[PDB]
Amino acid sequence: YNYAKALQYSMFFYDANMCGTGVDENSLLSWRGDCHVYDARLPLDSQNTNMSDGFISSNRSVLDPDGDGKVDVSGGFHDAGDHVKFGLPEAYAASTVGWGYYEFKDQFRATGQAVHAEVILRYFNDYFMRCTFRDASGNVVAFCHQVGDGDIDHAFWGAPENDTMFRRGWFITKEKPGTDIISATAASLAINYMNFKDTDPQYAAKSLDYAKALFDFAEKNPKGVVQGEDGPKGYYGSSKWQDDYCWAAAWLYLATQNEHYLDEAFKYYDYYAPPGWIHCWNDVWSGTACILAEINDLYDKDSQNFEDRYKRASNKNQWEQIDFWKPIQDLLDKWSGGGITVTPGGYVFLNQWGSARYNTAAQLIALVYDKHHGDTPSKYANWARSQMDYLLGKNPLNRCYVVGYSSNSVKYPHHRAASGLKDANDSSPHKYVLYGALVGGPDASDQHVDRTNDYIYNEVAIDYNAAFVGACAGLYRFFGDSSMQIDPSMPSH
Ligand SMILES: [Ca+2]
Ligand SMILES: [Ca+2]
Ligand SMILES: [Ca+2]
Ligand SMILES: [Zn+2]
């Protein structure tokens, strides 16, 4: 149960999912090369994209300044074990990994893993920026949130480098709401600014500029979530846009101290939501609550100004009790204190689809709470540790759910590239080790089937590994020893 090594390994899943013309330059995995490079030359028309003929006609000079009739929506990361790039979870992974790097930068540095983190975060955010088509004044005209289609992509199984199937570009326009994805993306870029403002001021400024523009687009235009027919159909069904909107707003206030953003956050912030679910691609209310609480600690610790402003904004009585950290304390008491179902084996299980993804998100929140409350481990961090240790092998199957981490790790993740096979049903060993991938996890009875075609319990994804990265760093922060060394034989930048 070496958290330094866990942190190191955790990011390699991202190298395995890098997409586009920049993968041999950015990925540390020799078995990954440039893929879907035709994404970089997507034809600008109403069939290869989902923008109307009229929209393209009126906006051609901004969408295609050079006039070669093609746009570049290449880059970023494949979503899961598949090759589609879905906007909602793409932004969730980018912001959540960024969220962890922002909170525990000291640990990434102490373990020599900060450079790896920055390469991954730059790859996520540079993709978002290239996909944000703005006029010269900075106004967002269109945002490509998805490349590919589950309906088409899932019908194939092979290395991404050899794929040639149709990969449509889906764009958000002022003609139809896309508030959830636009906001989720703006949040990531605002976090990118926070992560690079001291280290690369110019790059940070660019990220912040794009973040503010995206948020303004979300703010100014009619509200709604991107619909299934406009790209994610049943793969990533979005519940709402208000949490992503508030998440972006909170981060933008942190980045700019422009009161307007805090006012927007307070206008839609559901104080009752955090304790309900946990941080995930379809609900970032808990993460939002954490940021608003840190904002309060930073700028309004000894007074009730922010609390009273929030009550006025969400029309609550002035005497209602509001403590920005309380919703998260409730969430954590629920997760660490017996509120959420725990398996006979001692694993806190929300539900079977990506239980590990939910568990590690709770771990992250637990570690962030302790950091901001004396920066010392409490029952929350201690609980988080018990959960990470379960996932690392302290369970009924003595099974490590992080592939490649140990001899007892799962070995057959549901992943096209790593498998090196032509069919998920083929039971042969994988040609490559998908180091650091956190699989769906065990079922409610601590059982697990380690097969390439077990798409529930062996599923892997950018959103699955997102909070997991931060949790490892957070655990190293409070529990790392001199005995916890990174693996010197792993590829490095
Ligand atoms: Ca062009
Ligand atoms: Ca949402
Ligand atoms: Ca206050
Ligand atoms: Zn690709």
Count of structural domains, the chain: 1
Q: Token pair for residue 281? A: 């691609």
Ordered DSSP codes for 148-194: S-HHHHTT--S-GGG--S---EEEEBTTB--HHHHHHHHHHHHHHHH
d(CA 314, CA 310): 6
From the number of C-beta atoms within 10 Å of its C-beta (0-12, 13-18, 19+), residue 2 rates as buried
Q: Report the C-alpha gap between 76 and 85 in whole angstroms.
A: 8
- Point out the ligand nearest to the CA of residue 71: 1
Q: Is 145 a catalytic residue?
A: no
What's the maximum distance between 2 C-alpha atoms anywhere in the chain? 64
**Are 266 and 296 in contact, with CB atoms under 8 Å apart?**
no
Residue 122 in tokens: 């730059």
Read off the tokens for 13. 């899943």
- Using an 8 Å Cβ cutoff, are 355 and 349 in contact? yes
Q: Give the Å distances, CA to CA, from 230 to 171, 203, 225.
A: 8, 32, 10
For the CA of 27, the nearest ligand = 4
User: How many angstroms is it from 293 CA to the middle of ligand 3?
Assistant: 9
Query: Ligand 1 centroid vs 292 CA: distance in angstroms?
Result: 40
Are 332 and 348 spatial neighbours (Cβ–Cβ below 8 Å)? no
43 phi/psi in degrees, rounded to 5 = -65, 135
Residue owning tokens 């559901």? 270
Count of other CB atoms within 10 angstroms of residue 275: 21
Task: Report residue 214 as tokens.
Answer: 């995206």
CATH code of the domain covering residue 236? 1.50.10.10
Dist. CA 298 → ligand 3 center (Å): 9
- Helical spans, DSSP H, in 222-304: 242-256, 259-268, 285-299
Q: How far is CA 316 from CA 263, 310, 326, in A?
A: 15, 8, 16
The answer to whether 189 touches 214, Cβ cutoff 8 Å, is yes
The answer to whether 457 and 449 have CB atoms below 8 angstroms apart is yes
List the resolution, Å: 2.1
From residue 164, give the alpha-carbon distance in Å to each of 69, 156, 161, 173.
20, 10, 9, 27
Active-site pick, 78, 414, 415, 448: 414
Ligand nearest to the CA of 62: 1
Question: Which residue segment(s) compose the domain that 455 sits in?
Answer: 1-493
Question: What is the CA(477)–ligand 2 centre distance, in A?
Answer: 30
